[PDB]
C-alpha cells in the first residue's frame, strides 16, 4: 500500500499544509493543490523531511483515497520541486510537430495543419518534428492537454500515424 | 549477441555472421582454419563483435542431441522422446561429456554427463 511511504520533504521552498478538505504543497514551481473529499480518510502529518500519512479509518473508499492521496502527495512534491515531463509521439511520414511561442502546431493526415494552445507552466519543446516534450509542474494539467489533443484522431493501428502517448499500444492486422 | 551453428566448411546458415562487422570470406577462412580439426561435424560457436574483427569469437563444443548420435553410432534424426535413437555407449558418452564440459557451465565430468543426458532426452534416449 503506497498510502504509507516515506515521501521526502524538500526544505528549499516546499512546505505542505493539510486543511480539513484540501492539501497545499508550495515550492519553487508554483503550488500544487490536492482537493480532498469532505471527509478525512487519511491522518495528515509532515515530519522533518519526511511524510507518512496513514489511514485513520478503513472503508470502501477510505483506503482507496488513502493510497491515491499518498501517491498524489509524492507526485505533487516532486513536481513542485522539479516539475514533470510528458512526451507525445507525432509519428507519420507527413506528420510534423512544431512550437511557436507557447502554441503547438501539428501536421496530421490533413493538408490543413491544426494548432493548439498549452496551459501556462507547462512549457513545450520540439527536438524532432515527430516529438513533443511538455515539461510542466503538475501531471494533471499536462495530461489534460494530452487528452484534449488525442481524442480527435488516434494513431493508425497498423503503422503509427498519429499521436502516441508512449503508454498506449496498438495492434496490427491484415491490410497493407 | 547473435547465436549461430556452422559446419566444418560452409557458413551459409543465417546472416547473423555478417552482423559481426567483417567481410564474409575474410572470417570464413579463419573459422575454417580454427575448425579444421572439427571438419564434417557441426559446431555451434558464439560470435563476439569487434571493429575490424581480427579475432573475437568463442568455440562452443558441437551440440549434444545431434552429437548424441555420434555416441549412439548412427545419424538418425528425431524430435520426440518417444522414438528411440539407437543405443548410446558409455565410453563415447564420457568423451562427449568431457568434450562438452567446456561448453557446459560446470567443470566437473559428472555434471557434464548429467547435462548431456538431460539434453539427449530430446531425441529419445538418456545417457546410460
Amino acid at each position: 500500500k503506497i498510502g504509507n511511504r516515506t515521501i521526502t520533504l524538500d526544505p528549499a521552498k516546499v512546505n505542505l499544509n493539510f486543511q480539513k478538505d484540501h492539501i497545499a504543497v508550495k515550492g519553487p514551481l508554483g503550488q500544487i493543490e490536492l482537493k480532498l473529499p469532505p471527509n478525512l480518510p487519511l491522518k495528515f502529518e509532515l515530519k522533518d523531511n519526511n511524510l507518512q500519512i496513514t489511514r485513520n479509518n478503513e472503508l470502501k473508499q477510505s483506503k482507496i483515497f488513502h493510497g491515491t492521496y499518498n501517491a498524489l502527495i509524492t507526485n505533487a512534491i516532486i513536481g513542485v520541486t522539479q516539475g514533470f515531463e510528458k512526451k507525445l509521439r507525432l509519428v507519420g511520414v507527413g506528420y510534423r510537430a512544431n512550437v511557436e511561442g507557447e502554441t503547438l502546431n501539428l501536421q496530421l493526415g490533413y493538408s490543413h495543419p491544426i494548432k493548439e494552445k498549452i496551459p501556462k507552466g507547462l512549457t513545450v519543446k520540439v527536438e524532432k518534428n515527430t516529438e513533443i516534450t511538455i515539461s510542466g509542474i503538475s501531471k494533471e494539467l499536462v495530461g489534460q492537454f494530452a487528452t484534449e489533443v488525442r481524442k480527435w484522431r488516434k494513431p493508425e493501428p497498423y503503422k503509427g500515424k498519429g499521436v502516441l502517448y508512449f503508454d498506449e499500444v496498438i495492434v496490427r492486422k491484415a491490410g497493407k | 549477441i547473435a547465436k549461430i551453428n556452422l559446419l566444418g566448411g560452409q557458413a551459409k546458415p543465417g546472416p547473423a555472421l555478417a552482423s559481426v562487422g567483417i567481410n564474409m570470406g575474410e572470417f570464413t577462412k579463419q573459422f575454417n582454419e580454427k575448425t579444421k580439426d572439427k571438419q564434417g561435424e557441426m559446431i555451434p560457436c558464439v560470435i563476439t563483435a569487434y571493429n575490424d574483427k581480427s579475432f573475437d569469437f568463442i568455440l562452443k563444443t558441437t551440440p549434444v542431441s545431434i552429437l548424441l548420435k555420434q555416441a549412439a553410432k548412427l545419424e538418425k534424426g528425431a524430435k520426440n522422446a518417444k522414438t528411440i535413437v539407437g543405443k548410446i555407449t558409455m565410453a563415447k558418452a564420457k568423451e562427449i561429456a568431457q568434450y562438452k564440459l567446456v561448453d557446459l557451465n560446470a567443470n566437473t565430468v559428472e555434471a557434464a554427463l548429467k547435462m548431456v543426458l538431460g539434453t539427449a532426452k530430446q531425441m529419445g534416449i538418456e545417457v546410460i
Binding site: - | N105, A106, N107, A111
Partner: protein, 126 residues
C-alpha cells in the same frame, strides 16, 4: 521465515567463525553467465555462490565474530560467493568473476584469516 532467519544466522555464523578466511564478494545484478564462469573455475573447491538475505547474513556476521554490521548489509541485490575449504582457488574464481563483472567490489572477508582489502586481497587472490 523467522525460524529460517534464526537457522540461517546460526549456520552462517558458524561458517564465518570456523572459516574466518572467507570473501563475501557481492555483485548487484548477479548474473547467470558470471555464476557459470566462477563455479567453472571454483569446481574442485568447496565454495559456492548464492544471492542471500541481507538481514540473516548481517546478523550472522555480527554473531560470527567478524568486523561489520553494515559492511555485510543493505546494498542493492546482495550476492555472496563465500570462501569455503581452500580460499586460494575460491579467490582465483572470485577474481575471475570480478573480471567478468562490469564493476565488482570487495564487500568483506579475510584471506587465510588475515585482514586483506581490495589493495591487498587481490595481491594474493590473483
Amino acid at each position: 521465515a523467522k525460524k529460517d532467519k534464526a537457522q540461517q544466522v546460526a549456520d552462517v555464523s558458524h561458517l564465518l567463525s570456523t572459516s574466518a578466511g572467507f570473501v563475501i564478494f557481492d555483485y548487484t545484478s548477479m548474473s547467470a553467465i558470471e555464476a557459470t564462469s566462477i563455479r567453472k573455475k571454483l569446481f574442485k573447491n568447496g565454495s559456492k555462490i548464492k544471492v542471500i538475505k541481507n538481514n540473516i547474513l548481517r546478523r550472522a556476521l555480527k554473531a560470527g565474530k567478524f568486523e561489520g554490521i553494515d559492511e555485510t548489509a543493505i546494498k542493492g541485490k546482495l550476492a555472496v560467493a563465500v570462501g569455503v575449504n581452500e580460499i586460494v582457488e575460491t579467490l582465483k574464481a572470485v577474481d575471475g568473476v570480478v573480471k567478468a563483472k562490469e564493476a565488482m567490489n570487495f564487500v568483506c572477508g579475510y584471506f587465510d584469516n588475515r585482514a586483506f582489502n581490495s589493495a591487498d586481497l587481490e595481491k594474493i587472490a590473483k
